[PDB]
Amino acid sequence: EFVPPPECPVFEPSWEEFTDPLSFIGRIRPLAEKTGICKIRPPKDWQPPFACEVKSFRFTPRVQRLNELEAMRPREAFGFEQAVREYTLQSFGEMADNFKSDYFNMPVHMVPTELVEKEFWRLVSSIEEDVIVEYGADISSKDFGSGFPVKDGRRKILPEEEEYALSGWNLNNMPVLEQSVLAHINKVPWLYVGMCFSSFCWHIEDHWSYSINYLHWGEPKTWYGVPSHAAEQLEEVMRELAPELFESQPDLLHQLVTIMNPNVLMEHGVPVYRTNQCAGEFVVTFPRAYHSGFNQGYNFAEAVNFCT
Ligand SMILES: O=C(O)c1ccnc2cc([C@@H](OCC3CCC(F)(F)CC3)c3ccccc3Cl)[nH]c12
Ligand SMILES: [Mn+2]
């Protein structure tokens, strides 16, 4: 069965340390950059309201066949394996909980995180079982608003919520402009509505950028991370073991479909760290830190790349 990687570092900054995100990330860097990813729990009283326009929030999630790589005799009428469905936030969550509770035959919050993890990686490599889920991924915060309150005049902000619209940990307030000469001669957060087994495969950010990720609410998001000093070793393991049909593809295109069990990387000398990102917690990925993961259940996340 799947062997869980060691836990990545978790930081619980004081109110004084929480005053500056870039300053705090710079101070934890000597440890966190050696693990690729880290988790940051804000102070207990720091609780931002959910500011998405929930009434009109509608989306068509992408279909994810967990064993699509392992399944590579073509199936009859391949390409039409799933009917397309549009959801609201409510109807997607009702579908999400029904799937997980039917799959494990128990209430969604009673399923151990270790069990969903072991089942996810078994299904990914299983040919005898075709599990298909949906992921509301890469939803632009410009469509229905950010999960954080923002002072843009498009939605009401209560006085007790103004501190969160101005907070440096509001992902809409992270610095995103990279310095360059072209910037003298010449990005918003993305949203992720997850369900059980919805996943994102191994990748690094464009320009080897940092990324910060916040889980607004819902069941945990399980992460795996690799430190940047082992980036070449992971890419070598990919070249050796990933499907040879995709071997010559550029990294940007390869990264779309590169799922790999973390135990395979660990067996080949790649250090891997895990964490369960719970509601209200941050996850920071450092430059060129390969990361991947899946969702334990119905949740809502927001992510953006930032510059230092
Ligand atoms: O789902 C999450 O919580 C989550 C957390 C952290 N990182 C990611 C990345 C993604 C998606 O990739 C978006 C692009 C953006 C442009 C890029 F940065 F150049 C590459 C990645 C994706 C990647 C493969 C398979 C499914 C999905 Cl949805 N989801 C993430
Ligand atoms: Mn990412």
Domain ranges of the chain: 1-308
CB neighbour burial string for 15-52, b if at least 16 within 10 angstroms, e if fewer: eeebeebeebbeebeeebbbbbbbbbebeeeeebeebb
Kindly identify the ligand whose nearest atom is closest to the C-alpha of 200. Answer: 1
Q: Helix, strand, or coil here: 179?
A: coil
Method: X-ray
Distance 289 CA to ligand 2 centre (A): 9
Task: Classify residue 163 by its DSSP letter.
Answer: H
Tell me the CATH architecture of domain 1-308.
Sandwich (2.60)
Distance 287 CA to ligand 2 centre (A): 11
C-alpha–C-alpha distance, residues 285 and 292, integer Å: 11
What's the reported resolution, in angstroms, to a tenth? 1.9
C-alpha–C-alpha distance, residues 265 and 119, integer Å: 18
C-alpha–C-alpha distance, residues 198 and 133, integer Å: 6
Ligand 1, atom 4: closest residue by C-alpha: 200
- Residue 211 annotated as binding site: yes
Write out the DSSP string of 50-62. Answer: P-S--SS-EE-PE
Residues framing ligand 1 (Cβ under 6 A): 135, 137-138, 192, 200-201, 203, 205-206, 213, 221, 255-256, 301, 303
Distance 159 CA to ligand 1 centre (A): 34
Closest Cα to residue 304, out of 4, 21, 69, 82?
A: 21
Closest Cα to residue 144, out of 296, 302, 306?
A: 302
Kindly identify the ligand whose nearest atom is closest to the C-alpha of 223. Answer: 1
Task: Give the residue, out of 203, 253, 274, with the most ligand 1 atoms within 8 A of its beta carbon, to mutate for a pocket test.
Answer: 203
C-alpha–C-alpha distance, residues 288 and 301, integer Å: 21
Q: Which amino acid is at 255?
A: Q
C-alpha–C-alpha distance, residues 202 and 243, integer Å: 14
- Residue 205 annotated as binding site: yes
Q: Which amino acid is at 172?
A: N
C-alpha–C-alpha distance, residues 231 and 272, integer Å: 11
Phi/psi for 134 (5° steps) reads -130, 150
